[PDB]
């Protein structure tokens, strides 16, 4: 079940790793789009622990938590039904495998070019199976203006 | 200039929430400096607003004064106390000898406070009864941190856990983890009499029955200070006075500078290298 | 074994007046911890027993927690608090974070409170009027240290200046150094409006005011612990509660290391050595 | 006068063996300090008789020296640096001044030495490959510490770590660790 409707002005979204300068792109975004709320939820990186990051929303200072983990980011926005995965061309399948058991989410974009064909063959089949839309790879991302922005598409402001 | 504006934005770093220096007056955690004199609380009151940013009641405040008192000194042998003296018979000013006697302060030297804190915590929170519990430390060849003093066993209490004892089951609401190390400690006395709650060990065990009984704490902010290590800060705020007193003492009396006995060394150097 | 018959003398170093840990139970001047307790003393009751031996009254006691309040905390933008911070959020313990942050206060920073005791005692001792004062101040070259805030200056008031003030006049029996103080303020705020009394100023000069005002104290003893530096205590052992909530609000916020920018620096090094 | 007669015991504690400040000359290990300007070692020299109590030899004392000139500094926006210079901008004598900067050195700021040593000395001593190695650092959701710089890349070397790399492959007689490190 694809949905028509991928992105709306109440859509959320998880950033997969450490790119506080697209995260930074997207609030400047959300803000310029005279947009209510910001519309990045929480941010992903198994690297470091759970703590929050600071980010402007227009001249105001903001928290956006950042998770170890996935299950608690899903659990704890269950608003959330888009997944950016900054990921690299190796860590991208299994970060899009663990993406896809969650049924909240209905579309990742993933970023990074290079993966192999045969695990792309996977994740079509996956996303066929499951009907989450994946825009990408080898993508810079997509942008609704009004709405949404997906990671350094565009530019900045 | 163009900040007054407004046409600029800084990433603004080093977040704090303790105290606000601006304005008119001072903020300690949302209540200005002559509301926390209007209200007439204590040191415990003003630690409890730049600890804990939280308006404690009287009686947690009280008591957070009652466990820096018994801190504040126990003598000049202790670890911290002798670095305390040698670095101000050495000529140093107070912030040199009081930081080099804390300095000392760690796992051994006033580390009971934290991790018998700690070690009760995990006793009860895992739902193991003082029976099991001290087989259990017996068996994994540790001793029970904050339980056992040297000279003063049975009908010759410390005098100093009484009172602490006494104001927390008067004035405390509600003591579970104090009555498990009381439970505890009736174990271990019947196994040895000496083997009591120390004062490290009952300001510990009622410090963290102090923050997940009272109000204002939401169950894991109580648990997370001691993590964090508030219990090692009521330590060393306390020990601060007896060693600021170790200095003032050891310049009044104007002595000069200690060297250490040859015969008290024992050197076990190798024959040639 | 030879020393418990008696037949032997050593040399006995270390010693200390300030604390019995032996005996029975733990004794501060020549009170026991229980009398300490059954009297309802304060904190300020065992600053009075550990630094400077004696029993202090009420009205001292507790004006010696007053200024222990006063002086707790006073933002992160200061300097021992910037050092607090900075070793804290590099991944350090509360002892070296508030170590790091005490050493610190020193003379530029903290130390306004020992120098402007010790100003106004040398000005107040050698017989010299407030006007005569300022004007020898003014043509030495140096500043009246403890005196001039930066904003708040004519009815608008430090609002713990107030406070402390307020306290010294309805409780202290006698104030001539805190009415002398207060001229060398008229004379001051006639100069120019924000040169009023600081807190560190305040504080020193009451602090003075009390020891050689109140009882208990032979006036050599009143000015020795000031050429000593009690004051400088006061400061250090009333920030250390500041410095420890630094801590504990840095490590509950989990703030990642800090590198200071590159922007921030301008390097001036030599073109080739 | 009972200890000059041999009389009496006394328990000693304080059990040292890295100075002989008694007798006629300063001993560091066993050898006296004109034995050590005699023989003409370095400052690892004593770093050799102090820290391990045992005379290493030239190449190793060099290196000591070696890596403690490339530590010597590294700006002063580090952490470390930034504690000294407010420290010592307030007034402050030189011992609280360094002192101040020297208790900032933990796990973050300076700790990537003895962890990113004792990391890779687990690795070697339990017998994984490298490439297992960085597969099992990855999936258990931690960095390699002591791996990874900001900008020096590929064909933009150090230039510090270059030196110390070359005066470890001519000079040392065995690398076991430092080909698995190149190797990792
Ligand atoms: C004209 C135009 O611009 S059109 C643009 C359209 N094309 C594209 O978008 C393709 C561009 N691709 C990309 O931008 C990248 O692939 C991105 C965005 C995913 C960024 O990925 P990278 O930065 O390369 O990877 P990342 O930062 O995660 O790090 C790479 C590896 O370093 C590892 N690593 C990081 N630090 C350490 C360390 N200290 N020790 C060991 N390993 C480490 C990471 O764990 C990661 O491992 P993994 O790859 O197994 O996960
Ligand atoms: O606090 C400690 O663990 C050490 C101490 O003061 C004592 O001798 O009782
Ligand atoms: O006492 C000092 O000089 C430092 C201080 O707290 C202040 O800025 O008021
Ligand atoms: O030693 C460290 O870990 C920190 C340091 O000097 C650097 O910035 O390279």
């Known amino acids: 079940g694809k949905s028509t409707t991928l992105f709306s002005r109440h859509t959320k979204a998880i950033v997969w790793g450490m790119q506080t300068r697209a995260v930074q792109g997207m609030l400047d975004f959300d803000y310029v789009c005279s947009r209510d709320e910001p519309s990045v939820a929480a941010m992903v990186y198994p690297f470091t622990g759970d703590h929050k990051q600071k980010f402007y929303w227009g001249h105001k200072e903001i928290l956006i938590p ?15 039904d888009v997944l950016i995965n900054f990921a690299s061309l190796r860590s991208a399948y299994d970060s899009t495998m663990e993406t896809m058991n969650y049924a909240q989410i209905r579309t990742i ?49 | ?62 008591f957070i004064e009652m466990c820096l008192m018994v801190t504040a000194d126990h003598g000049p042998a202790v670890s911290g106390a002798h670095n305390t003296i040698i670095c101000a018979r050495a000529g140093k ?18 580390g009971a406070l934290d991790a ?52 927390v089951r008067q004035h405390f609401p509600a003591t579970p983890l104090l009555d498990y190390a009381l439970e505890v400690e009736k174990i271990t006395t019947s196994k040895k009499p000496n083997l009591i709650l120390n004062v490290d060990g009952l300001i510990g065990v009622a410090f963290v029955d102090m923050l997940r009984n009272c109000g204002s704490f939401t169950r894991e902010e109580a648990d997370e200070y001691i993590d964090i290590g508030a219990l090692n800060g009521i330590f060393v705020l306390g020990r601060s006075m007896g060693f600021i007193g170790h200095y003032l003492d050891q310049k009044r009396l104007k002595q000069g500078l200690y060297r250490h006995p040859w015969d008290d060394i024992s050197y076990v150097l190798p024959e040639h290298m």
């Open chain 2, 93 to 110: 000013d107070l912030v040199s000898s009081l930081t080099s006697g804390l300095l000392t302060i760690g796992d051994r030297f006033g």
């Open chain 2, 116 to 167: 018998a804190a700690k070690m009760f915590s995990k006793a009860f929170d895992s739902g193991i009864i003082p029976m099991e519990f001290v087989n259990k430390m017996k068996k994994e060849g540790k001793l029970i941190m904050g339980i056992g003093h040297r000279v003063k066993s049975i009908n010759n209490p410390d005098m100093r856990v009484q009172i602490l004892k006494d104001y």
């Open chain 2, 1 to 62: 200039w163009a900040r007054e504006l407004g046409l600029i934005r800084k990433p603004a770093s080093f977040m704090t929430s303790i105290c606000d220096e601006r304005g008119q007056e001072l903020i300690y955690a949302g209540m200005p400096i002559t509301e926390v004199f209007k209200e007439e609380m204590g040191i415990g009151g003003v630690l409890g607003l730049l600890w804990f940013q939280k308006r404690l009641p009287k009686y947690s405040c009280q």
């Open chain 1, 109 to 157: 974009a993933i970023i990074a070019e290079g993966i192999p064909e045969a695990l792309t063959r996977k994740l079509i089949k996956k996303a066929d199976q499951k009907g989450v839309t994946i825009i990408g790879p080898a993508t810079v991302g997509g942008i609704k203006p009004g709405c949404f922005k997906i990671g350094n598409t565009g530019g900045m402001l």
């Open chain 1, 66 to 80: 950042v998770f170890k983990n996935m299950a608690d980011a899903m659990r704890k926005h269950p608003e959330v």
